[PDB]
Scaffold this active site. Structure first.
Site, PDB file in Angstrom:
ATOM      1  N   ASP A 229       0.897  -1.315   0.031  1.00 12.72           N
ATOM      2  CA  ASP A 229       0.002   0.100   0.006  1.00 12.72           C
ATOM      3  C   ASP A 229       0.865   1.077  -0.158  1.00 12.72           C
ATOM      4  O   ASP A 229       0.316   2.334   0.111  1.00 12.72           O
ATOM      5  CB  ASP A 229      -1.025   0.097   1.172  1.00 12.72           C
ATOM      6  CG  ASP A 229      -0.584   0.299   2.474  1.00 12.72           C
ATOM      7  OD1 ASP A 229       0.673   0.901   2.871  1.00 12.72           O
ATOM      8  OD2 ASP A 229      -1.265   0.235   3.520  1.00 12.72           O
ATOM      9  N   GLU A 272       0.438  -7.222   3.043  1.00 10.49           N
ATOM     10  CA  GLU A 272      -0.676  -6.740   2.842  1.00 10.49           C
ATOM     11  C   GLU A 272      -1.362  -6.713   1.517  1.00 10.49           C
ATOM     12  O   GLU A 272      -2.258  -5.955   1.211  1.00 10.49           O
ATOM     13  CB  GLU A 272      -0.811  -5.187   3.127  1.00 10.49           C
ATOM     14  CG  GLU A 272      -0.794  -5.127   4.684  1.00 10.49           C
ATOM     15  CD  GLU A 272      -1.923  -5.254   5.604  1.00 10.49           C
ATOM     16  OE1 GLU A 272      -2.637  -6.040   5.405  1.00 10.49           O
ATOM     17  OE2 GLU A 272      -1.977  -4.486   6.502  1.00 10.49           O
TER      18      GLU A 272
END
Ligand SMILES: N[C@@H](CCCC[B-](O)(O)O)C(=O)O
Ligand SMILES: [Mn+2]
Ligand SMILES: [Mn+2]
Length: 308
Positions: A229, A272
């Protein structure tokens, strides 16, 4: 630069749960196989089975602390293991709370390691600063020496012990940092390069200084904890907490092409990636593909070419 694939299908560090099914998309995307096309010596320690803890009530507002503290403790010994084998640990993970056990075990075999954290968030919330309870935004919190004494006794982490100093870590790509986290940033004097500094300096200079801040006095081990991210959502959209104005595909590749070239890559975390968060089929493959390319760059794949 031998590799030690380590799969951590964990997710109890945040709400959404498809993140643990990430070592899969990556592995199946062709990770370990594409690593072979490179002069990479690869040994896959398989996926780490993280048995659940049915009885895991919130500690204050801290969620799944025992489930998280155990899976990190579990990974810590597994990473220490590949490290004690003369191999770089590759942690294909679920959520970023695994960096507690990732960096932790790395330090057991290499206590002089420097951490390079690529993320849109600082993830430095103490059990008392955080306002969501998601342990995936507190990992750096359990890892710093300065803060121990400010980190309560969250059940499940009594195996932890601050392994790095505020001066052994750098942040690249910050754009979503909470008020409690910023104060810890400025107070402990953590060197960082938010998106503002990448914009002002260019990733070229950003990377020059980072490495020089880490290898200036000694060529010491580097721990790259990469959160997808950190890259703009237009590249890695299948991710839990996306923020606009992120690192570009190219900057994602530049950061890692440079790091590799130090020959000091010792530990790495690709965290993630959550397929199920892809609102379309090509959103999942674009996240996994960008994640595979970041990994290959970490191990030699150069945009200018490679030759035997
Ligand atoms: N600071 C927010 C966001 C955490 C972001 C975590 B990360 O880096 O793994 O996406 C929280 O403490 O919950
Ligand atoms: Mn993170
Ligand atoms: Mn993040």
């Amino acid at each position: 630069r031998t590799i030690g694939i380590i799969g951590a299908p964990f997710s109890k560090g945040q709400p959404r749960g498809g993140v643990e099914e990430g070592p899969t998309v990556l592995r199946k995307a062709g990770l370990l196989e594409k690593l072979k096309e490179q002069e990479c010596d690869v040994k896959d320690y398989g996926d780490l089975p993280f048995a659940d803890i049915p009885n895991d009530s919130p500690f204050q507002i801290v969620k799944n602390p025992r489930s998280v503290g155990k899976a990190s403790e579990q990974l810590a010994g597994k990473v220490a293991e590949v490290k004690k084998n003369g191999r770089i640990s590759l942690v294909l993970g679920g959520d970023h709370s695994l960096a507690i056990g990732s960096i932790s075990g790395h330090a057991r075999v290499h206590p002089d390691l420097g951490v390079i954290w690529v993320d849109a968030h600082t993830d430095i919330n103490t059990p008392l600063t955080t306002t969501s309870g998601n342990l995936h935004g507190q990992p750096v919190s359990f890892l710093l020496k300065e803060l121990k004494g400010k980190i309560p006794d969250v059940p499940g982490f009594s195996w932890v012990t601050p392994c790095i100093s505020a001066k052994d870590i750098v942040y690249i790509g910050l754009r979503d940092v909470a008020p409690g986290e910023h104060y810890i940033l400025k107070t402990l004097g953590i060197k960082y390069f938010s998106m503002t500094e990448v914009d002002r300096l260019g990733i070229g200079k950003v990377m020059e200084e980072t490495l020089s801040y880490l290898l200036g006095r000694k060529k010491r081990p580097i721990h790259l904890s990469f959160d997808v991210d950190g890259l703009d959502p237009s590249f890695t959209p299948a991710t839990g907490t996306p923020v606009v104005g992120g690192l570009t595909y190219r900057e994602g590749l530049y950061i890692t092409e440079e790091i590799y070239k130090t020959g000091l890559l010792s530990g790495l975390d690709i965290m993630e990636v959550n397929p199920s968060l892809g609102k379309t089929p090509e959103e999942v493959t674009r996240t996994v593909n960008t994640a595979v390319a970041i990994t290959l760059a970490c191990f030699g794949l150069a945009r200018e070419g490679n030759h035997k």
